[PDB]
Amino acid sequence: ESADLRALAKHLYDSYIKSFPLTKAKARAILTGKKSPFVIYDMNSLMMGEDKIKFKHITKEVAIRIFQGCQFRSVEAVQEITEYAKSIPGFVNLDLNDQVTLLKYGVHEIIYTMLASLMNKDGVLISEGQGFMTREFLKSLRKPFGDFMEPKFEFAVKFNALELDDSDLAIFIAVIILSGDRPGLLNVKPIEDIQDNLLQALELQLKLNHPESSQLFAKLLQKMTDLRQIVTEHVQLLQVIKKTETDMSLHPLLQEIYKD
C-alpha cells in the first residue's frame, strides 16, 4: 500500500495549499529576499502600517492593539483549519461531537505549528505577508505582552531547524487533528484508526522527502511534546490577561466573537 500512502500525502498537500493562503514556500521566499513587505519595528511604523497594511481589525493602547490583532487573525485561521480538516479522509464521517472536540483542542497546536512558517529569528510575517513585525519590537512590548510573543519565536527557531516543507506539514497538521487523546471524545477507535494512516503517510513522506535526515519522523513526533507544553503555558497567560487588563475590554459582540 505504498502507492496508497503517497496518494493520501498528495491529497492532503493539495487541500493544504487551497485552505491556507500563505504557504511556507511563499513565506520563505519573502523572508529571504527572493514586492518587498512593509516592516513594523517601532511605534511610528505601526501607526503608518495601519493606514497602509490596512489591517482588517482596527476598530488606544499599542500593546493591546497588537495582541487583539493576533486574536482576530487566529479566529480567521480556525475557520481555515476547519475547512482543511474536512478534507482528511474519514474526518467528516466521525460523530459530530467528536469532530467539534478534535477541532476545539487541536487548533491551538496547529496555529503555533503554522506560525513557525511565518517566522525567522528576526520577526514574523503578517497580513498574508505584506507586513513584518520584528522580534525586537515584539520582545520589548510592555506588561506581560512582551513575554507572550517571545516563546513562539524560541519554539519556531527550534522547530524550523527541522526544515519541513508544506507537503510535510500538511500531513503533520492532519496528525495533530486526529489525536485520540482529547478529553470528552465519544468514539476513540475511528480517530486512532485514521491517525495510523496519517502516521504511516507522514513516515513515508519524510523518508522520501528527507532521505538524509535520519529519524526525522521520530524527531517531529517529539515536537508534539513541545507544542502541548507551549499551548498550556499560553492558556495560563490568557487567564492573567483576562484578570489584569480591564483596558482589554471589548464591545460585547466583539468579546463574543473572540471568546475562542
Added chain:
Amino acid sequence: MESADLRALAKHLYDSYIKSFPLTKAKARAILTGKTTDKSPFVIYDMNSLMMGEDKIEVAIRIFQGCQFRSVEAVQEITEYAKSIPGFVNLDLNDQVTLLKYGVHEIIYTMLASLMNKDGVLISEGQGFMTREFLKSLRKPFGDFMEPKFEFAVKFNALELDDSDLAIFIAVIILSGDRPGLLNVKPIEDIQDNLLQALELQLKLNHPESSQLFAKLLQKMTDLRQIVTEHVQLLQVIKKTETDMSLHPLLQEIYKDL
C-alpha cells in the same frame, strides 16, 4: 546503522536494565496477576491494614515520605543505568547532569506504570500493594498526588511493552537534546538517533502486529512531560504548607528550576 548492530545495542541495554533495576515489569506482572503462592503481596487499603503492614513488610505524610525515599532509590538506579548508555559518560559533565536532572522523573513515572494496575501499585520491592482508592482518599492535597500517575499507567500499560522495550525507551528519554541548558546538543542527538533506530527495529520485531507502536510510544512522551509538571507544582504547594517536611539533597537538586 546495520540491523545486526541495532540488535546488539538493544541487547546491551536490556542486559544493563536487568542489572540496574531489581524489580522488572516481568516480575511485577507475575506478582500482580499471581496464582503464585510464594509471590503474593500484602494489601493496604485502609489505616489499620497499613499499621499491620508495618509489622509484616500523620498517615498521609508517612506515605509521602515513603514515596520520597523510594524516589531517591529510583534516581540512584536510573543514574546507574544511564552510565551504561554508549556515549553517555563521554559527554560533557554539565550535560550529563542536565540530562539526568530533567530525565529521571519522566523515567520514574514510566517505570512506576510497570508496578500499577487499575486497582493499585506494588510497593517495597513487590511485597506490598497499596490500593488506588486508599491513596485517592488521603487528606489535604495528598489524595491528588498519586491519581494522575494511575491515569497515565492505565493508558501506558495498554501498549503492552515489556522490559526489552522499556530499556530502549528509557534510554531515549535520557538522551533528549531539547533539555534546557544543554551545551552540546549535537552529540546528544547523534546518540538519541542511534537509540531511536534501535527502538524502531525492536518494536517492529517484538510487536509486529502492533501497528505504529513506535509512533504511539513516542507520543506518550507528551503525557510524561505533563505529569512531571503537575507533580512539581504540588511539591511547591506542600513546601509552603508543611514547613516541618524536608527533602533529600538528590531530590532537592532535581527540582531546582523546573
